[PDB]
Amino acid sequence: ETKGTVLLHNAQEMLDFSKGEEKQIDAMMKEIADMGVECIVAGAGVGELALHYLNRYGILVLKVPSKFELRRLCRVCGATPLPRLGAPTPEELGLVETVKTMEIGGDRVTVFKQRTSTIILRGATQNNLDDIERAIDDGVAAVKGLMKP
Amino acid sequence: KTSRGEIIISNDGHTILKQMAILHPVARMLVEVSAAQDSEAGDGTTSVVILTGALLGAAERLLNKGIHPTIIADSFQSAAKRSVDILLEMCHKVSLSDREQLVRAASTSLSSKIVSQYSSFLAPLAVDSVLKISDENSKNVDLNDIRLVKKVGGTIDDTEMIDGVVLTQTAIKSAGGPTRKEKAKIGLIQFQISPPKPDTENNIIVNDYRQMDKILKEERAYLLNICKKIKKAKCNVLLIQKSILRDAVNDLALHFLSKLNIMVVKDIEREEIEFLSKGLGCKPIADIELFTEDRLDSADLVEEIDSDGSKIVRVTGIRNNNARPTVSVVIRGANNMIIDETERSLHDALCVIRCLVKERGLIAGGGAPEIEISRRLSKEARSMEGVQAFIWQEFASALEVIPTTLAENAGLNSIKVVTELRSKHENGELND
Amino acid sequence: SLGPRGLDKILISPDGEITITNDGATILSQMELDNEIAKLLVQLSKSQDDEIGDGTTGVVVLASALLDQALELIQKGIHPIKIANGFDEAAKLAISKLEETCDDISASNDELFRDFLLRAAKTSLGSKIVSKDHDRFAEMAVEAVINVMDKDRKDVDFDLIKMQGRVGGSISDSKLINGVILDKDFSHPQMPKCVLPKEGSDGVKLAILTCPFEPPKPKTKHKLDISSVEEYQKLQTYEQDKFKEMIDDVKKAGADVVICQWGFDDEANHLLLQNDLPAVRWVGGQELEHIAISTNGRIVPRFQDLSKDKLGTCSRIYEQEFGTTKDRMLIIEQSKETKTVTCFVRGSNKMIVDEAERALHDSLCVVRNLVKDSRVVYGGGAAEVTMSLAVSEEADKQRGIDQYAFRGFAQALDTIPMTLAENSGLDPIGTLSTLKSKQLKEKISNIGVDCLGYGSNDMKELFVVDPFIGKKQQILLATQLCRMILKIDNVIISGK
Amino acid sequence: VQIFGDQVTEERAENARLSAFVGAIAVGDLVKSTLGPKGMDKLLQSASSNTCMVTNDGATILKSIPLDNPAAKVLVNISKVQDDEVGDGTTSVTVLSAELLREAEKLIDQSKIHPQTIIEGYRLASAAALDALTKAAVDNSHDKTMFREDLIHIAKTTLSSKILSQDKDHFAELATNAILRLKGSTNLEHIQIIKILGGKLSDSFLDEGFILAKKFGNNQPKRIENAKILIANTTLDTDKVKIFGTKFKVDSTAKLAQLEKAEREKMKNKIAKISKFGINTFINRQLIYDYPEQLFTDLGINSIEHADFEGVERLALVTGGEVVSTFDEPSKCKLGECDVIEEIMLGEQPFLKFSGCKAGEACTIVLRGATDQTLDEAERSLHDALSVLSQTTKETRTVLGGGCAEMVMSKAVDTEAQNIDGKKSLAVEAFARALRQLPTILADNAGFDSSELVSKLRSSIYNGISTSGLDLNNGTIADMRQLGIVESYKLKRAVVSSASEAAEVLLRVDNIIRARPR
Amino acid sequence: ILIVTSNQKTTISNDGATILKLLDVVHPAAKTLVDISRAQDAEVGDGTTSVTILAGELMKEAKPFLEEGISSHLIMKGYRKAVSLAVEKINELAVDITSEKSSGRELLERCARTAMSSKLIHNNADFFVKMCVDAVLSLDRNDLDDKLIGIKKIPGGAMEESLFINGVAFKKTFSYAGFEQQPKKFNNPKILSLNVELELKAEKDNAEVRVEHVEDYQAIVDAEWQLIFEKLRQVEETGANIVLSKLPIGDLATQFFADRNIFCAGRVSADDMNRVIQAVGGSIQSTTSDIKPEHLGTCALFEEMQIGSERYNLFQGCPQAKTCTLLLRGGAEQVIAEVERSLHDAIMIV
Ligand SMILES: Nc1ncnc2c1ncn2[C@@H]1O[C@H](COP(=O)(O)OP(=O)(O)O)[C@@H](O)[C@H]1O
Ligand SMILES: Nc1ncnc2c1ncn2[C@@H]1O[C@H](COP(=O)(O)OP(=O)(O)O)[C@@H](O)[C@H]1O
Ligand code: BEF
Ligand code: BEF
Ligand code: BEF
Numbered sequence A: 001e002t003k004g005t006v007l008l009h010n011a012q013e014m015l016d017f018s019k020g021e022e023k024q025i026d027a028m029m030k031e032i033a034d035m036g037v038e039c040i041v042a043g044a045g046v047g048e049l050a051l052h053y054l055n056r057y058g059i060l061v062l063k064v065p066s067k068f069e070l071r072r073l074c075r076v077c078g079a080t081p082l083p084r085l086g087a088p089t090p091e092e093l094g095l096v097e098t099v100k101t102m103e104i105g106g107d108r109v110t111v112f113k114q115r116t117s118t119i120i121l122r123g124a125t126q127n128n129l130d131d132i133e134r135a136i137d138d139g140v141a142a143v144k145g146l147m148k149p
Numbered sequence B: 001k002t003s004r005g006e007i008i009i010s011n012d013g014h015t016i017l018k019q020m021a022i023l024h025p026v027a028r029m030l031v032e033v034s035a036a037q038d039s040e041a042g043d044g045t046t047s048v049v050i051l052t053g054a055l056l057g058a059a060e061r062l063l064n065k066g067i068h069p070t071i072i073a074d075s076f077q078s079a080a081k082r083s084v085d086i087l088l089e090m091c092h093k094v095s096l097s098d099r100e101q102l103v104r105a106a107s108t109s110l111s112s113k114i115v116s117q118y119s120s121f122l123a124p125l126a127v128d129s130v131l132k133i134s135d136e137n138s139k140n141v142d143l144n145d146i147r148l149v150k151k152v153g154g155t156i157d158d159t160e161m162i163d164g165v166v167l168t169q170t171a172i173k174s175a176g177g178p179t180r181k182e183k184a185k186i187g188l189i190q191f192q193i194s195p196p197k198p199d200t201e202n203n204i205i206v207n208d209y210r211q212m213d214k215i216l217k218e219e220r221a222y223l224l225n226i227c228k229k230i231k232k233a234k235c236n237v238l239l240i241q242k243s244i245l246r247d248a249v250n251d252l253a254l255h256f257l258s259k260l261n262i263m264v265v266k267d268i269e270r271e272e273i274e275f276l277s278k279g280l281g282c283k284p285i286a287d288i289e290l291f292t293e294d295r296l297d298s299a300d301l302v303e304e305i306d307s308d309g310s311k312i313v314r315v316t317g318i319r320n321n322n323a324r325p326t327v328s329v330v331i332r333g334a335n336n337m338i339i340d341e342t343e344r345s346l347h348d349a350l351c352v353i354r355c356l357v358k359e360r361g362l363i364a365g366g367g368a369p370e371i372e373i374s375r376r377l378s379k380e381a382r383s384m385e386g387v388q389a390f391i392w393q394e395f396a397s398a399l400e401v402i403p404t405t406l407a408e409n410a411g412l413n414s415i416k417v418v419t420e421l422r423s424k425h426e427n428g429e430l431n432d
Numbered sequence C: 001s002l003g004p005r006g007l008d009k010i011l012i013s014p015d016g017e018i019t020i021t022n023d024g025a026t027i028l029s030q031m032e033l034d035n036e037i038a039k040l041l042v043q044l045s046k047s048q049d050d051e052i053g054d055g056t057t058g059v060v061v062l063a064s065a066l067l068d069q070a071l072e073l074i075q076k077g078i079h080p081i082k083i084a085n086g087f088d089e090a091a092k093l094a095i096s097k098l099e100e101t102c103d104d105i106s107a108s109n110d111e112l113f114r115d116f117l118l119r120a121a122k123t124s125l126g127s128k129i130v131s132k133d134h135d136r137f138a139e140m141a142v143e144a145v146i147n148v149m150d151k152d153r154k155d156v157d158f159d160l161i162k163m164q165g166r167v168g169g170s171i172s173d174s175k176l177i178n179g180v181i182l183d184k185d186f187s188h189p190q191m192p193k194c195v196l197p198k199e200g201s202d203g204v205k206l207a208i209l210t211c212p213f214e215p216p217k218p219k220t221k222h223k224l225d226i227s228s229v230e231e232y233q234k235l236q237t238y239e240q241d242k243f244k245e246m247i248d249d250v251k252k253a254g255a256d257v258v259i260c261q262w263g264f265d266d267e268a269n270h271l272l273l274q275n276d277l278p279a280v281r282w283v284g285g286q287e288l289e290h291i292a293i294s295t296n297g298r299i300v301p302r303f304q305d306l307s308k309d310k311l312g313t314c315s316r317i318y319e320q321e322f323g324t325t326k327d328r329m330l331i332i333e334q335s336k337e338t339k340t341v342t343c344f345v346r347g348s349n350k351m352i353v354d355e356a357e358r359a360l361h362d363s364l365c366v367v368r369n370l371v372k373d374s375r376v377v378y379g380g381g382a383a384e385v386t387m388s389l390a391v392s393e394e395a396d397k398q399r400g401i402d403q404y405a406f407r408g409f410a411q412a413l414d415t416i417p418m419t420l421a422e423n424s425g426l427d428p429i430g431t432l433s434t435l436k437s438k439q440l441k442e443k444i445s446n447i448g449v450d451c452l453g454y455g456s457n458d459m460k461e462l463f464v465v466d467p468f469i470g471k472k473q474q475i476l477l478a479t480q481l482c483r484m485i486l487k488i489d490n491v492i493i494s495g496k
Numbered sequence D: 001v002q003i004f005g006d007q008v009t010e011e012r013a014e015n016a017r018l019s020a021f022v023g024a025i026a027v028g029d030l031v032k033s034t035l036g037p038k039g040m041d042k043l044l045q046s047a048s049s050n051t052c053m054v055t056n057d058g059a060t061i062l063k064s065i066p067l068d069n070p071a072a073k074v075l076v077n078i079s080k081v082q083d084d085e086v087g088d089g090t091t092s093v094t095v096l097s098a099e100l101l102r103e104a105e106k107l108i109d110q111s112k113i114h115p116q117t118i119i120e121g122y123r124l125a126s127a128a129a130l131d132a133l134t135k136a137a138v139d140n141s142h143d144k145t146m147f148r149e150d151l152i153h154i155a156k157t158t159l160s161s162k163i164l165s166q167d168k169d170h171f172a173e174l175a176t177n178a179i180l181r182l183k184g185s186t187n188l189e190h191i192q193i194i195k196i197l198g199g200k201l202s203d204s205f206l207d208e209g210f211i212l213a214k215k216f217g218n219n220q221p222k223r224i225e226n227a228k229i230l231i232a233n234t235t236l237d238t239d240k241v242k243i244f245g246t247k248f249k250v251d252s253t254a255k256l257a258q259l260e261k262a263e264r265e266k267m268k269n270k271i272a273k274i275s276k277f278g279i280n281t282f283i284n285r286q287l288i289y290d291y292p293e294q295l296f297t298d299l300g301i302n303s304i305e306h307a308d309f310e311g312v313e314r315l316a317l318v319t320g321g322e323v324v325s326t327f328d329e330p331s332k333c334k335l336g337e338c339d340v341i342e343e344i345m346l347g348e349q350p351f352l353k354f355s356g357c358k359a360g361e362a363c364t365i366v367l368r369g370a371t372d373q374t375l376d377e378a379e380r381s382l383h384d385a386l387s388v389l390s391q392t393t394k395e396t397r398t399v400l401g402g403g404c405a406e407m408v409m410s411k412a413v414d415t416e417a418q419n420i421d422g423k424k425s426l427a428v429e430a431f432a433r434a435l436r437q438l439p440t441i442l443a444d445n446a447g448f449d450s451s452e453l454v455s456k457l458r459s460s461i462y463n464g465i466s467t468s469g470l471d472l473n474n475g476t477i478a479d480m481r482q483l484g485i486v487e488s489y490k491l492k493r494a495v496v497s498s499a500s501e502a503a504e505v506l507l508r509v510d511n512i513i514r515a516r517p518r
Numbered sequence E: 001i002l003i004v005t006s007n008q009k010t011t012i013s014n015d016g017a018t019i020l021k022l023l024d025v026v027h028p029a030a031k032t033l034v035d036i037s038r039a040q041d042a043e044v045g046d047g048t049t050s051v052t053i054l055a056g057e058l059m060k061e062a063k064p065f066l067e068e069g070i071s072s073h074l075i076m077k078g079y080r081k082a083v084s085l086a087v088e089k090i091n092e093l094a095v096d097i098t099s100e101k102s103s104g105r106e107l108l109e110r111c112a113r114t115a116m117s118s119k120l121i122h123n124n125a126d127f128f129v130k131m132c133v134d135a136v137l138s139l140d141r142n143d144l145d146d147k148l149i150g151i152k153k154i155p156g157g158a159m160e161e162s163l164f165i166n167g168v169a170f171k172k173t174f175s176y177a178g179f180e181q182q183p184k185k186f187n188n189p190k191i192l193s194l195n196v197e198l199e200l201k202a203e204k205d206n207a208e209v210r211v212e213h214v215e216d217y218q219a220i221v222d223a224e225w226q227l228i229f230e231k232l233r234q235v236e237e238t239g240a241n242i243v244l245s246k247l248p249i250g251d252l253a254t255q256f257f258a259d260r261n262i263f264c265a266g267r268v269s270a271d272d273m274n275r276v277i278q279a280v281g282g283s284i285q286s287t288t289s290d291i292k293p294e295h296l297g298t299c300a301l302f303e304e305m306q307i308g309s310e311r312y313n314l315f316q317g318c319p320q321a322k323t324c325t326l327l328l329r330g331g332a333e334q335v336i337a338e339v340e341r342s343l344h345d346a347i348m349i350v
């Protein structure tokens, strides 16, 4: 969190800092590839050096998620997210049935099918679809009204 | 009244023309001629303009009479050649060291300007000056060496030639009270007396507590050594150049300097070094390891006065060989403007003596040359005949304008004066 | 402004800069247009200039008459799309006849191929105010493309050929230099003007560099931390040494002249003089690359990498008094053929200079097109007329609705020869009816307008020669832009 | 149907011809009074700055005044071009340039001939005007005696039309001597033109050596006798540092005192390394720090700071030294030496005047006079003189001026028209007629019946007396070789070339399109 | 239709979504007709015009009932079924073409051939049909996307002079010192697809250097020129002869390739690099100090053919590729737009 300055004193440090930075994160990814993982979902950022090694290790990567998604994805596959990168636990992993790039409307979209579900209400006018989401939500909540009482 | 706001009161013609707002390009050319007369004589900046105005008036009538201007221009310049020749033959030479006449020459130039009340003491002490600053091989004399300093208050009366040096700044007095040092030796400093840094980007980084108290230890020391090496060469006056660079002279170093009874004068322009070096028989000093009794001055008294409530720095009595000679003159005056004019009336007189260093001859004045030339250049043209004779005649008629305006300022019948002045000049020649 | 009897339009930028040209593309590219169709034509000529270089002027003329020939047929009651379609199938019959009839320079010897390229250079030039020295100006455009284009790849790079302009004297004094001109002097005033090859070498050898003659510093931000005074004395006596380690590095490589990208230090400059190393302070990135290719040399990163094999071979290096009072320049010339060739164009006026450059490029482009397509057609209207006749005889065979469109396409083409004979000073119908008739009475398809004024209309013996692709592209682009306008009927413009 | 955007102007054929001519003529006619001996000066003045200038140099007029007519600006540039490539013939280019175009309008309207045909006719004539020019050319050989007197003439000719007409002879030797002195270099930086206000114009001079607008290192000796000089580019006040970033990290103040004294030593040593050179004169482009300034004086070495890449180069040419940096090995670098560097006074300012020098290959001319505008012009006028001459060191053939050169052309051109025939023939004659319209103005400004005198000179020249030129004070036809009104061939060759180009640029003009101003 | 937008952007078109989009619709109910068009380009590509046409003419043939006192509720209770019945008509009416005498490729051909007619390239359909239909084939991954057959645009030239590339292309030349001195034509190359910037760190991670002793100086600088020798000779010791990278290749990097007779390019289009690897069979590496010859690519011929006086990098003739690149000409710079939108209208029918 505090400003990360990199003080190089001798020329021996340059060669070993960069080439060691290669390994430093290759060893970050190997501790997650040697756990038998096949899909890492990233909320925050991802490094170009880091994606390179995960690129070779034969593993899919999914960036972008904000708070909303990590939680609702968490409930479907059955994982448990960790902030400390040094504890990929077998007891805190997930399990997904299909993770493919199903193109809808021409959009490259990733799917996480098979808990939390999702409806894909298709239509024409992006105007009316918006209303029928409020029709759906009228009932989705009317179901939550049945349970509790 | 200046575009900028300042009030200027003058008689010096170049000073008059430069400061009014002349707009017509050809009219501005006149200022240039008046400027060029100042840069050849310092006097006659008024004469030279009026002449152009009567020569042009001449040219006009000739153009009225249908003469191609190229002929006019060239024959007017042929009128120059013959006239300056006359002045060179009619002039009576001067003994290059003859006070009784050289003094009359300054006394002439002043008597015109608001300083002519005290022309009695102003004329000689402007003549006294240029000869001291002159040479044996004469040459061309630099007036940058004559030091004219201003301070408001009193009367033009209170002007004085100082028997040494006047200085611009004052004794620092921030620490201690040194101001009037007697039997003094003056040091002159190029360097900074501070806790200085090298020209490269440097910074004292601190690791330990025990580094701190020892940093001030050397700091206090470093400044004391410089002040010690000064007292050790044996000087009681310091003069330091412009510190716009970085350091200056420290307030911590200043108390050292005070209790050590060395009297300090800071902030002195770089232009001022060349003059001060010669004026105070004192070699300028760049580094400390080159501060020596050798390069000190040995002046009799240095004492800062209190004039109007406003001080000046005096250096009177200077011992050693003056291989370079330098004067310093203090100008007082009741009103700001009547000080600036005093300086411009000194410079005009100082300059007439300079011209006497240049061409060692002197003429009669009060129009006398301008009437002779008129008479001479008439007889020349009566021989000429044809077209280039009428020009010279109109030219001779023009030169006469000087005595006319001279007389017309005196409220005289300029016509009566001149006709009589030419008639008497037709016999009695070059003095009427 | 069409033909060798063409005139020049004189356009002024909003700032004030003056241009006086004949390049149709330039003309239209300068005028502050507004009417969307005019705007489009601006791009129409701007298109040609790129895909070819010459023709920019006649491309518009052909499009407008085609739009005019459509107009008359519209007021007759015909659907535009069917006309636009009727034009394109009539354009495909014009290019087909041109191909089957165009002469060819592929079946030629080497002595006769370099002539046909001059004949085209001549053609393209005679039009613009360069015509004066169009013997010399043409013998330039040809010299350039032979020297620069990879023979088998048949590809000429116009990044390789540099256009240099400097004002003085006359256009006659415009020269082609087998090397490079630089606006640079010699780094030290005492250095010599000429540099002569050490006799036994047959070359000058160049120290082409890309590091400054300055004590090396790193890319990543740094600092020293000097505590010991002696270690400031170890550094002080490193600064002068790390300079001598540069001079010797070059002197030991065996170079006679140093051309360096970045700038030399003040200390390094004098030491460059003492050891007789004429230096060139601050040389352009593109310009270094042009130097290294002309001299056969190589480009050197650091001093450590300099060797007697990465040197630039020259026959002369001289600083020329470019002006009589202005500024000096550096010429690095060769007697041999070098892949880069700078084209130095001079004139008596900044406007001629720019037009002269603008003529060579056009002239240089017709010669580039003939290297790509070694086939020629004959201009002076002849090519347009053969196409006019070809489409005219096939209109009666077309029948139905397109009978009028084909007859239109052919008829609007005839404005080129008519507006050639017009500017040139003949009767439009006369030259047309003589020319088109003569091209049937004889089997010859190479008969055109004597726009200069000689007895014969025989474009062959007169050397009025056009490239093939040039002619073809000048039609396809017209008919295709023409179809686009005709397709348009509904127009909606916003507010400015 | 409007095509262009707004504020846009379309001046087509019929109107574009007007502009092209109106422009050229309007400009040609502006400078017409400049031409020749009894020619006059213009007073130009800016709105900006409250500045003005009184001038002859025809470029200096055209370059200055504002204009809108694009055709005019064409000629305006052809004026600068000439001032670049030759330095003189500014007004001669413009007038001949316009007089061609005047003569075109008279053909394009009155007769109704094609502009392109006029071109193909103005072309045949130009190549024939330049032809005879070389045949009539007088190339001056190995006789440097016969060539100096030849140079002095060219100047005398160039000079007569400026304020310097009256002192022609005087200024002619000040140019001839300065250029010869220059030893065949064609760069004019080597002649420093210092104008100091005051005195006569006849008071102007070329100094034997060099006058420097610089000062001595302080309380230093005011006159060095028997000089030996080191010329330098090395740092001094800035304090030499190895470029990168040598920051001082002193653990405790103590070391900083040593490190301050270190920088002083680094100096004391670089002055010592210079002291080894055995020299009494150290002159440096760079500033001499307050410190080094004293270190030289204590050693006795005279030190002169701040004379830039300019001043240093000339000193190197005049003293025969070298622009030295480094100073690590005194053996290999060539010192300068002159006789006396005494400081003089000129009106007010102090200048150090090097006198009696090793090699005179660089010089200073001090111009004098009564008015800042007279100076101005003297400088401008001298540059016109220091040009023809300099370029006649390069281009060493001469042609007889006084209208003669242009006439010998009008001859060949007019006879070439007697050969050509057709509608072109009229245009070829016109070219010659334009060429005649030159002596016309030469005479016109002097004042005699132009018509009679040009017609008196045509005959003589056409009849084969191809010396005859215009005695422009007596109003007669007189011999130009025997009266010595010679000019540069490189001058005239250019005047014809340049003009012939302009016409062939504007004559192609039939459409002037102006954008909406920024 | 010729539309000039509020920002001078002149556009000519036949594409219904492109006409309806460039028109700013403000009326809320008429904005539906912009969406209705938009959905049609999104799922199909063609029809965009016809969809709006139908829509309005349903509303217009409902007005004669709305004038009479009828409830709109019942009107739409009647349409809702009508469309559900219209879909039933087509499903029964649609012909499975694999059953009855059709060519393998004359299915997509005779289908693009319909999409072309109406638009500008009608008189050139022949050319464009036997190209863009073809372009969907090279595109075929088991399941495909048009992002891989990216179109490039080049001003000038006849729209017939458009060129089908069985590899990749760059509307992008860059130029450094050596780029002219380098060979710009190969036959069988090994394409190294890189990512990181080959130079002396031009936008990289900043690290301060503190050096006490002077001799460390030439060491720290000689570390740099050695740090990129490794990064560069790492490329030479790959077996490569064409070097492309997402980040920049410097002046001092291009040198080593120039002399070592290797072609290099910097600042490659992000989309183009993913366009290269799919048609070169390579792999984008972010580091040189790892690369195995299992990452390189190949083609039939790489050359820098100059088209329309702009330099294009053309590496083509790739046996098994799941990507191609169209390279499009056209008269004016507004034609090239209405052929690109015209061709997207054929591809998506194909
Ligand atoms: N010497 C000539 N004789 C006859 N016709 C010519 C001659 N030179 C050019 N032409 C014809 O005139 C036209 C020249 O037009 P030009 O002004 O060069 O513009 P562009 O060629 O760019 O359209 C060409 O189409 C050519 O057929
Ligand atoms: N003393 C003279 N007698 C006769 N002709 C002269 C004399 N001096 C100059 N000329 C002629 O006058 C012209 C020079 O006039 P000038 O105003 O200097 O024009 P430019 O600036 O174009 O040289 C030349 O054509 C020259 O032949
Ligand atoms: F009015 Be003056 F210059 F004595
Ligand atoms: F007038 Be052109 F483009 F030859
Ligand atoms: F009026 Be000039 F340039 F002799």
Ligand code: BEF
Pocket: E014, E015, E016, E017, E045, E046, E047, E048, E049, E050, E115, E345
């Ligand atoms: F008008 Be469409 F998008 F076929």
Ligand SMILES: [Mg+2]
Pocket: B043, B044, B109, B110, B112, B348
């Ligand atoms: Mg007086």
Ligand SMILES: [Mg+2]
Pocket: C054, C055, C123, C124, C125, C127
């Ligand atoms: Mg052409």
Ligand SMILES: [Mg+2]
Pocket: D088, D089, D090, D158
């Ligand atoms: Mg002249």
Ligand SMILES: [Mg+2]
Pocket: E046, E047, E115, E118
């Ligand atoms: Mg459709």
